[PDB]
Amino acid sequence: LYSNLINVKQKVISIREKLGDPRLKSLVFEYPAGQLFRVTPKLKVSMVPKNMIGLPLDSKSNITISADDYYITDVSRNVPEAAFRTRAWLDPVINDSGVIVSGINCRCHVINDKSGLSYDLILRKEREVRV
Amino acid sequence: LYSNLINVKQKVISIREKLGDPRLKSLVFEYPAGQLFRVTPKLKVSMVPKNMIGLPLDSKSNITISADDYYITDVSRNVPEAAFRTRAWLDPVINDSGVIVSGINCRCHVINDKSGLSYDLILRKEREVRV
Amino acid sequence: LYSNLINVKQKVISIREKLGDPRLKSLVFEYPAGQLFRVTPKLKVSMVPKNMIGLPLDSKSNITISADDYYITDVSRNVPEAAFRTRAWLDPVINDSGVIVSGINCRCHVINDKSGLSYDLILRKEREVRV
Amino acid sequence: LYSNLINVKQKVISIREKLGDPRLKSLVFEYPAGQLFRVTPKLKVSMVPKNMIGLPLDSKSNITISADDYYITDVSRNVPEAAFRTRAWLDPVINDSGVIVSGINCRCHVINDKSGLSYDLILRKEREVRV
Amino acid sequence: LYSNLINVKQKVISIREKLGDPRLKSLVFEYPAGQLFRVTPKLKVSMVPKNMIGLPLDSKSNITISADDYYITDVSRNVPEAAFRTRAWLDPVINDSGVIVSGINCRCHVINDKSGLSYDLILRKEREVRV
Amino acid sequence: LYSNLINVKQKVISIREKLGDPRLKSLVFEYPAGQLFRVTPKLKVSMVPKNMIGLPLDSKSNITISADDYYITDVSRNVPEAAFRTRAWLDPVINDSGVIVSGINCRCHVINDKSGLSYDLILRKEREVRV
């Protein structure tokens, strides 16, 4: 069916969090304009190693940076597609208010959507991060 | 035989649309001069990730673009070959008239025709799109 | 034996034409000086995708072209070797005379002869074609 | 569980040191500010071959160096993550004091953390080493 | 033993010539200073495709050439090693005298000697050939 | 154990020399300062093909050379590690004295030590050789 398949995939994946593994990271998005959208499972993510590159703002400049990216493997399709056009945060903290203080700032760099029941995406860290 | 094989392939593939998967996208072509040709199955398509490149209009210019392409896997051979020389639209909308208002503009970039009973093609998005 | 093997290979391959597949293309050569040599089987051929390159006449010029090539897989060794040094035509038309009007002009670019009983060759389209 | 799994992995790996193999090297870190953190198992490490490169301090200079790196395969996750942000020493010697005299100076270059129960890391030798 | 193994390999390979295949080419060398050394089996050889390169005499010149090479697979180790330092001829003709009139001129470009009982070598055609 | 394993590996490999194969080459080192260290087995070695490169003494000069390297596969770990920092000779001749007259001069270029019971190394020929 592909409709209940994504939801059952979320239910079966929710077993992974009951086992304490350190690869699990909390991902949040800001899909609506002002407030946040959180992925339900505390999914796992790997880190592709860094590469030393020029600035993406101006490539032919003295300022250079290291591009750091994260590889998120099992992320449900139930999340809105337009969420991927908005900045994402890995391990964020929410206060008493609706804002976030600390976390690791990332932007969706490349989408892999070959599997029909889950997305898989790589997201690049911002050049300036909070923590 | 290869004649009825393409038609039976269309009939068996028409099962995929009865199952609700999000990878299915509607493809239309404009093979005749003025009006449209629609592929029968609501086939699936993947997105190859973007690459930052110079302008194809003038390569050695300040203006740069991102080349975005789509990978259409199961497309029948029953479609006319000359349709591939005309612009294509992914998820288009047809009004009361014969024209299209909105959709994602693409052009056939590379043809893979190794299989004798279906085409497989990658089509590059236009630099300017409607939606 | 390798002598009757090529001829039996031609006989068994002649079954493929009795089945209507669209990958079959008629190849002709002009091996003797003035008249034509036609390969017996209506063999199949794939199209390797195009690449944008400079002119082979002068590489460091403003004029650029797209190199288009065809991959012919099952072609018998019974054809003369020296035929491969002459221009080839894919889907040609012969009139009442011995000349050809229309067809797709190609030249043998690379030979693969690893198999002892058939050639396999890739042939590059001419920069100027008839149809 | 993933909690006792890392500790049992340390216990089973502690068998490797009871067998005398020469690939085993002692790794120490300086995770707290001033004193040292030693990995429990005398784990094995391979040497990726050297490459001749420019200076990382100034790339477009006359001074060039050879980048030498070590590939540490089985290293437990029980070590603090922040230890990887501090210099590491391969085969170090500790005196009567808390300082180290001799050893091979290295810095964590790339982290591979695909396995959920062990890290695997490559660490680049410093340009100036003690021994 | 490796001594009789090469000779038995020559005897068993001598079956291939009794079967008429077109991949068989006669190779001769000029290992002694003035007269010729012929390999015993009429071994087979494939043609790696051509590449357009600058002149090896002067690389940064207007004169360019195409490097054409041949891949000789089954060649016995019984031939002297020093024969490979001398020019080789594919399909040569010997007259009534000890000289050769026609043939395809080649020089040993790269040696593959991984197998302990046969050589395998690629030999590059000379820029100027006889036929 | 890994201690007797290297010695038994030397004993079992000493069978290879009792069979006459031409890939066996005698390797000697000069690990102590003045006299020689010979590897016990007459191990086999392959030749990686040559590459045309600039001078390693000055890269941006008119003088160019061909880098020739040898791939030594089965070499025991019982040899001292510091031997690899000294020049090596393939097929050397020892006179009545402790010096060597003729042989093929090589230097350890890259070490592969993934296997815990044998080294495997590639060693580059010197630009000037004796024979």
Question: What single letter denotes the amino acid at residue C53?
Answer: I
Burial of C52 (0-12, 13-18, 19+ CB in 10 A): exposed
From B20, B44, B49, residue closest to A3, measured CB to CB: B20
- What's phi and psi for F16, nearest 5 deg? -60, -40
CB-CB contact of A92 with A28 (8 Å): yes
Q: How many CB atoms lie within 10 A of CB A34?
A: 7
Whether B3 has its CB under 8 Å from any CB of chain C: the answer is yes
Interchain contact D/A (3 or more Cβ pairs less than 8 Å): yes
Q: How far B69 CA lies from chain C's nearest CA (Å)?
A: 15
Of all residues in chain E, the one with the smallest CA distance to C58 is: E62
Strands of B104-112's sheet in order across: B37-38, B27-29, B88-90, B104-112, B118-125, B64-76, B45-54
Strands of D104-112's sheet in order across: D37-38, D27-29, D88-90, D104-112, D118-125, D64-76, D45-54
Long-range contacts of range D97-101, CB-CB < 8 Å, 24 or more positions apart? D98/D34, D98/D35, D98/D36, D100/D28, D100/D36, D101/D130
Q: Do C49 and B116 touch (CB under 8 A)?
A: no
Whole-angstrom distance, CA of residue F103 vs CA of residue B73 = 61
Q: Which residue has the tokens 């693409």?
A: B106
- Resolution as reported, in Å: 3.4
Of all residues in chain E, the one with the smallest CA distance to C113 is: E46
Whole-angstrom distance, CA of residue A127 vs CA of residue A110 = 17
Structural Rg of chain A based on CA atoms: 16
Whole-angstrom distance, CA of residue D25 vs CA of residue D89 = 10
Interchain contact A/E (3 or more Cβ pairs less than 8 Å): no
Any idea of the CA torsion for D48, D50, D51, D57, to the nearest 10 degrees?
Answer: 100
Experimental technique used? Answer: cryo-EM
Whole-angstrom distance, CA of residue A99 vs CA of residue A130 = 14
Q: How many CB atoms lie within 10 A of CB E81?
A: 12
Q: How far A15 CA lies from chain D's nearest CA (Å)?
A: 11
Q: How far B115 CA lies from chain A's nearest CA (Å)?
A: 20
- What's phi and psi for D124, nearest 5 deg? -90, 130
Closest by CA to C68, choosing from C43, C48, C85, is C48
CB-CB contact of D49 with F110 (8 Å): yes
- What's phi and psi for D91, nearest 5 deg? 45, 55
For residue C2, which residues of chain E lie inside 8 Å, CB to CB?
Answer: 19-22
Of all residues in chain A, the one with the smallest CA distance to B71 is: A114
Whether A60 has its CB under 8 Å from any CB of chain B: the answer is no
Rounded alpha-carbon distances, angstroms, from residue F126 to A12, F39, F104: 62, 20, 8
Three-state secondary structure call for residue F95: coil
CB-CB contact of D40 with D9 (8 Å): no
CB-CB contact of E89 with E27 (8 Å): yes
Q: How many CB atoms lie within 10 A of CB C85?
A: 11
Half-sphere exposure at residue F58, Cβ-oriented, CA atoms within 13 angstroms: 4
Q: How far E26 CA lies from chain C's nearest CA (Å)?
A: 16
For residue A116, which residues of chain B lie inside 8 Å, CB to CB?
Answer: 21-23, 44
Question: What single letter denotes the amino acid at residue B40?
Answer: T
Whole-angstrom distance, CA of residue A32 vs CA of residue A101 = 19
Whole-angstrom distance, CA of residue B76 vs CA of residue B42 = 11
